[PDB]
Structure formats: C-alpha cells, structure tokens
Amino acid sequence: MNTLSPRLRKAMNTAAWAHRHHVRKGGGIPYVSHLYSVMYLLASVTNDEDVLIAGLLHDTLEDVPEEYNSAQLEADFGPRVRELVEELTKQPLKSWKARADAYLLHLSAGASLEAVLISTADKLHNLMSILDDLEIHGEDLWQRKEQQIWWYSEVYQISLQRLGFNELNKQLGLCVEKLLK
Amino acid sequence: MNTLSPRLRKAMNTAAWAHRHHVRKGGGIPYVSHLYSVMYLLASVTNDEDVLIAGLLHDTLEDVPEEYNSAQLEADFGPRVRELVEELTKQPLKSWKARADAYLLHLSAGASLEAVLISTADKLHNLMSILDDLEIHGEDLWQRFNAGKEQQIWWYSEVYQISLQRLGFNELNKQLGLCVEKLLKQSALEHH
Ligand SMILES: [Mn+2]
Ligand SMILES: [Mn+2]
Numbered sequence: 167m168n169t170l171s172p173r174l175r176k177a178m179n180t181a182a183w184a185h186r187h188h189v190r191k192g193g194g195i196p197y198v199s200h201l202y203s204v205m206y207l208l209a210s211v212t213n214d215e216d217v218l219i220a221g222l223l224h225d226t227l228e229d230v231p232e233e234y235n236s237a238q239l240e241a242d243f244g245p246r247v248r249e250l251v252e253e254l255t256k257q258p259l260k261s262w263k264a265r266a267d268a269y270l271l272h273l274s275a276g277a278s279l280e281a282v283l284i285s286t287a288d289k290l291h292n293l294m295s296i297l298d299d300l301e302i303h304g305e306d307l308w309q310r311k312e313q314q315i316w317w318y319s320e321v322y323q324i325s326l327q328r329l330g331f332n333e334l335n336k337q338l339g340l341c342v343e344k345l346l347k
Numbered sequence: 348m349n350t351l352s353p354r355l356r357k358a359m360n361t362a363a364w365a366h367r368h369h370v371r372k373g374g375g376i377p378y379v380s381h382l383y384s385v386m387y388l389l390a391s392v393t394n395d396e397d398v399l400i401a402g403l404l405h406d407t408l409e410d411v412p413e414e415y416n417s418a419q420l421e422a423d424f425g426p427r428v429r430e431l432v433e434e435l436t437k438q439p440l441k442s443w444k445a446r447a448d449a450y451l452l453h454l455s456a457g458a459s460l461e462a463v464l465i466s467t468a469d470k471l472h473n474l475m476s477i478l479d480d481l482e483i484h485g486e487d488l489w490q491r492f493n494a495g496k497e498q499q500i501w502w503y504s505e506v507y508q509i510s511l512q513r514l515g516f517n518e519l520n521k522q523l524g525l526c527v528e529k530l531l532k533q534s535a536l537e538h539h
Pocket of ligand 2 (some may be wrong): 381
C-alpha cells in the first residue's frame with residue numbers, strides 16, 4: 167500500500183478542489199467521491215504513485231478544465247501524469263455507440279497498460295454505483311440496460327486481454343455478473 | 348486492504364455530502380480531502396470496516412451537525428460506528444488547553460483502541476497538512492505559526508506518546524513519530 171506522500175496529498179487536495187462544484191449524476195453527491203474511490207481501488211493493485219494521481223485526476227480535463235487544465239496538471243504533477251490523464255480524456259464524438267467503439271478500440275490497442283488499469287478502476291466504480299442505485303431505486307433507474315451490459319462486458323474483456331487477471335478486473339467481473347442476473 | 352463494499356461506498360458518499368460546502372481552514376480545499384486521507388491511512392492498518400467508516404465520518408457531528416447528526420449516523424451505519432465517532436467528542440470548555448488536557452486523558456484510558464487508532468490517523472493527517480503548508484508557504488505562514496508552535500509541538504507529541512503507549516509501533520505511529528520530529532526540525536531551522 168502506497169504511503170501518503172506530500173505529492174499524493176497535493177493530488178488529493180487538487181482533486182477535491184477542482185471538482186468542488188461538480189456532482190455525480192442523478193443526485194447531489196460531490197464528484198470527488200468517485201475520484202477518491204477510483205484511487206482507493208487502484209491502491210490495491212499498483213505501487214505507481216503516478217498511477218494513483220492520474221486516477222484521482224482522470225476526469226479533470228474532461229469535466230472541469232475551467233478549474234484545472236492540462237497545463238496546470240503538468241506543472242503540478244509532471245509530464246507522465248499528464249500523459250496518463252490525456253490517454254483517458256476521450257474526444258467529443260456525437261454518437262454514443264461511436265464514442266463507445268472509439269474508447270474500446272483505443273483501450274484494446276493504443277492505451278498504455280497504466281491507462282487500461284485506471285480505466286478498469288474507473289468503469290468498476292461507475293458500475294458499482296449503478297448497482298447501488300438499482301438496489302436503492304429499482305428497475306426504473308434505467309429510464310434516466312442492454313447497452314450498459316455490453317459496455318461493461320467489453321471493458322471487462324479488454325481489461326483481461328491487456329492486463330491479465332487482477333484484483334480490479336476480478337471485481338468488475340463480479341459486478342458485470344450481478345448486472346446480468 | 349478492505350474491499351470497497353456497498354456500505355463503504357455509502358460512507359464515502361455520505362462524508363462527501365455532509366462536508367460538501369465545508370472547507371479546510373486557511374485555504375479553499377474541500378474538507379473531504381482530510382476525511383478520505385484519514386480513511387486511506389486507517390485502511391493501511393486495520394480491516395475493521397466500522398473503523399474505516401468512522402474515520403470517514405469522524406468530524407461530522409463536530410463540524411457539520413446541521414448536515415448530519417448522530418441519530419442519522421446510527422440509522423445509516425449502526426450503533427458501533429456511532430459510538431466510535433462519539434468517542435472523539437470534546438469537552439465544552441472555552442480554554443483550548445483544558446479541552447486538550449481532557450481529550451488526552453480520555454485517549455489514554457477511556458477511549459477504545461479503535462478510537463485511539465482513528466484519532467491517530469486524524470492527528471497524523473493534520474500534522475502532515477501543517478508540514479506541507481510549512482514547506483510550500485514558509486514565507487508568511489511561519490509568521491502565523493510561530494506564536495502557537497509550542498502548543499502544536501506539545502499537542503502532537505502528547506498524542507504520539509499516548510498512541511504509542513496504547514497501540515505500539517503500527518504503521519501510523521511510525522509515521523506520526525516522524526512527523527513530530529519533522530515539526531521539531533522546522534522549529535529548529537527557524538531558530539537557527
Ligand atoms: Mn471517471
Ligand atoms: Mn479530523
């Protein structure tokens with residue numbers, strides 16, 4: 167388990183600050199709940215502090231670049247973290263399917279092993295959150311499923327193909343299995 | 348390392364929610380960064396999920412009681428979590444030293460080992476935060492810190508001695524001891 171270094175504490179503070187007005191979809195929960203959860207999931211599988219920090223910051227460029235842009239990211243955490251985060255910042259294609267296929271194509275071929283690990287943690291927590299929401303609110307949550315089953319199934323297979331079996335894609339599989347049931 | 352369970356996820360969201368507009372003193376950093384840092388620290392030393400949850404929620408009753416009270420803490424996370432968080436409550440004395448004396452007395456005997464551990468993670472992250480600010484803003488923050496550095500050194504070194512006596516050299520006490528000596532070197536470098 168990585169120790170809480172000055173650099174890691176700075177990333178934790180930056181993630182909270184940059185997303186301070188950012189909310190998880192469907193409620194009022196501050197978005198940093200998700201970022202911290204992704205970092206926590208990554209800490210069980212890597213020693214790479216750059217990977218933990220890019221986990222904390224992997225949505226900043228996409229979702230709050232008015233608060234924290236790529237230049238600031240690099241000046242605070244260096245070029246490697248900025249490249250990891252930029253691997254995961256997906257371009258604005260119009261069609262959902264098109265964006266999904268483009269993410270999945272990149273994930274299977276171009277993305278670094280480090281990027282695939284973060285993406286596994288990212289998608290795992292998102293699916294964990296979906297399952298929590300379904301249990302709390304019920305089958306009507308979908309109006310806000312078969313597409314989602316395909317999406318997380320595809321992420322799970324690509325994660326296995328690129329990384330082999332590990333603690334993160336293990337849990338993603340368990341979540342996909344519940345989702346299928 | 349504990350898995351991220353539905354209950355731990357709910358604690359994570361609850362801590363971020365209750366403190367959503369709470370900011371750490373001296374800056375603009377949302378307070379939840381302290382809470383998750385404390386939980387991450389606790390996750391390196393215990394597998395007790397109630398302790399991780401109490402770590403996430405340990406400042407709710409004190410700092411944002413209008414957002415989240417003890418009845419709700421118990422409804423959401425059960426009586427053991429609520430008891431753990433309430434173990435850290437302060438005496439209602441205007442005097443900082445009197446409150447500090449009472450809290451240390453409690454930590455040394457009456458507090459559960461679990462509450463000592465949570466308090467250790469809390470004090471450790473707070474001292475780490477002080478040291479971070481001293482290294483990045485040593486320009487003028489040391490001016491503000493000089494007048495109370497004696498209080499700070501006493502406070503953190505006393506918490507450290509009690510934590511060590513009750514818990515031994517776990518990972519958090521190894522780090523806390525170091526941070527206390529680092530605080531001393533910072534006082535030393537400024538006297539030199
Ligand atoms: Mn994400
Ligand atoms: Mn605290």
